[model samples]
Target chain A: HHSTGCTVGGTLNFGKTSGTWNNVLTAEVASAATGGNISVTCDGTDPVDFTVAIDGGERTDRTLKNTADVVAYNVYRDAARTNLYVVNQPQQFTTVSGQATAVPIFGAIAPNTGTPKDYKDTLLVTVNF
Target chain B: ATFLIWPIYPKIEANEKATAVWLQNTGKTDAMVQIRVFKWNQDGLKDNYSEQSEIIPSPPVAKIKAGEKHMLRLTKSVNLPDGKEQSYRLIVDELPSKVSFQMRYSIPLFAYGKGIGSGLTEESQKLNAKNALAKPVLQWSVRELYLKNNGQKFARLSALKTSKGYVLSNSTVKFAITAHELAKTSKIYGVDSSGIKQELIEITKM
Candidate 1:
């Protein structure tokens, strides 16, 4: 069972502005055919919450899916306390939340679609910078 | 075994005269010297192809002035081919009354392998095996490097008994060797002890 909802507003801060929310920019990086850098810059208000609502019931493990077969979803923060950089494996999505001084979150983002040998999928991310 | 220290390495080309070094000490009163040598390959401990006993004569005895260090030179005649590397150990034994001591060090040297004009190179290591006439078929540069001999020596005054697959000297010998090859069919150099037939690729050598 997957329940979807929005982040509580004013539930965010840009380090200086207190209890106020304004402009928002969703920085995003798409899948690449080969190797290259995916640099995203958010020029607007920090996002409150980023969510990907997966549809449908439970799916079997190692189950193959097309880009359109997004039936389930989850969110995770890129934390260094987790030794995140060493994982070059596949990732479906990522969400980051932090006060702005332009918080820099750098890490690898792999798509759940499959490895480069299998396929490439877009990484949908919603950020509250 | 008594203690002696000998450290000298030499390099020679094919059909070239080779020179080795040995040491002689004063009699049992810190006067007698002994030398022994063994053989091994780059894989190490593989007694196979050991040639020290067959390649050169063991170092003989000598007398040195009390409290003095003498340099007894031992030379040999070996024919090392090009593009090949050879390693050796020169040992010095100290034979003093009541106790025998010995020490040895390794000597690594290389002889040219194939000629500069036709030898293998990095561009050759990844050579594909499918083409016979293809000049640049990527291939693994299989470099062949092995120890020419493993050497050992003992203080003369001490009686010793040694057996095959056994060690008799209190002295120590350290042999380290590794091979790096790049090939399509080449699986990782380590034992797939896991039975994974994955092609062994690049290996890091430090």
Candidate 2:
């Protein structure tokens, strides 16, 4: 079970996929809770400086919340995940109202990871305009 | 099967009965989409999503071809109440494919009827109009550093700042503050149409 607000874009089957210790997964966007400074347009096609920010379970970092372990994964703007999307530093975009700006969020894990269990994280994924 | 959906934040305003959401298939193969709507509510820090049929997605299920776009109209079946907002979440899922992995999107949709800010002054009304018809009157309990939105709209709390630095969100209302922040920070930020670093409503229990 997950706390409401964000869409389960993709399930990162960390160990199951390719028998590899690290795997980069994907998630889509439709945040329930949103924040931002947006200036409206008359045609309703307002251009918004929309930002997607992530606040993971652990305040200081981005680790999957488990009963006794920690599986740390960082979100990225690209598939390679070269550019890290920080906790307070959101991924900002110039989007229009009613026009869906496609954001392919990449969730990446590190070298050798945590205990063998269902590691889930509750993130406050919000959009600000 | 990859997808691109539009109007991620769809708003059905006072006079409108429906809004449109578009689905674009950007991958090499076809995909099937199924959308289900639910009512959203909050109890303290936890949130609830239950099945509802008040807002129906037209063509509830569809098979979209590669490089094609499909429009799904979200029409409200029930008459919305005035002076308040109706919150709902649309669980849109892609029927799993043998060739590829599927994705699920839980989209939030807000609907409102006429008379939404009926008694507010011009300046106050302008503020609410741009803010999804919301006016977040925040009240923080100094002892616990907890905040509650005592307004008609939902507040998307984030990027809080104190005199020293920044702070943060919990539920749509009833914000969460850690023991570390409670001990350190004094001023917290709230979101509005103007900006994110706005003032706290009031500090009671002094």
Candidate 3:
């Protein structure tokens, strides 16, 4: 209940990936949300589930014509991907106030599998104190 | 894509029934935002969100131009808590732009009606087990590093280095470690009311 504030910039964009790749999302305390903790959870919004993020365009449903392909990936609370990050499931940490905290997100795509086209999944990263 | 929210952490005191939340859109293009509030609860070590009409957010949906700011007010229709603290999640959703993604922000708000001034106490008695009402009663285990918060207020835990280059941490009353994305930890650190680091040992059977 302390006056806490958190901020995240841009997007989790994982550029082009053919094999497995990992990326980190940094969230800043931004303000003096001290004396308490803020919990964060990154889940699929486009797909709504932790399972998929359509081939292109942030669409939640996987249609037939718009590159009917699927890329299986997961977001984690740790960089080692030991703790899978799920929607509603959050990763909490002490507020450092004005500091940026890094959350490592990992994605995997098999080589030469599922039409070789641009693929992306939208991750709705949420922060609550 | 420039956006900012103020009072990122806002609270409703026992005396005051309302507070102001500001949203600023500094981007070049106009943006439409929908504001929503949810009653937040902690159970089974997980946070739950259910839509309630007790606390009303005025201007449920807002449209802010490229470089303008907006103010939303949250007013409580319920009485102050009897003792324990109350929490809520105020969410702001950014409408998508022609197949674009919708960016959402979930902010936390707490009501300290009964616990309004209970946080004030003698520095020496802050961690005194006898002063349980002034702080959080926490317990954890090695498996999934299971954690439980049994105190009046919330807890923030960290300082685990055995995560093997992975950062393992948690909050809320009930959350655990699955050893996958969460480290099955033994020794974790917590800070008491005085801001001193307190090491919490592990429990054999959680």
Each model's DockQ score:
0.01, 0.06, 0.17
Q: Rank the candidates by lDDT, best first.
A: 2, 3, 1
- In candidate 2, which residue ranges exceed 4 Å CA deviation? A1-129, B97-101, B117-134, B142-145, B163-187, B192-206
lDDT of 1 by residue, B1-206 (tens): 12122322232333334434433232234455454443433344242225463235334556555445555444444444433334344433334300001122222222222221111223322331222321111111233421121112111111111111111112222223334322233322221110012122221221
TM-score of each: 0.27, 0.54, 0.59
TM-score winner between 2 and 3, please give it.
3
By summed lDDT, which 10 consecutive residues of candidate 3 chain B come out lowest? B163-172
Q: List model 2 lDDT by residue over B1-206, tens digit each.
A: 55555655565666667888777776678878787777777655446678787788888898888888888889988778766767777666677500112345555676765555322235436645755435555555544365555556555433454532111112323334555655565555544322222334432221
Better of 1 and 2 by lDDT: 2
Relative to the true structure, candidate 1 has a C-alpha RMSD (angstroms) of: 29.4
iRMS (Å) per candidate: 37.9, 12.3, 7.1
Candidate 1: lDDT over CA atoms? 0.26
- Winner by lDDT between candidate 3 and candidate 1: 3
Residue B164 in candidate 1 has what lDDT?
Answer: 10
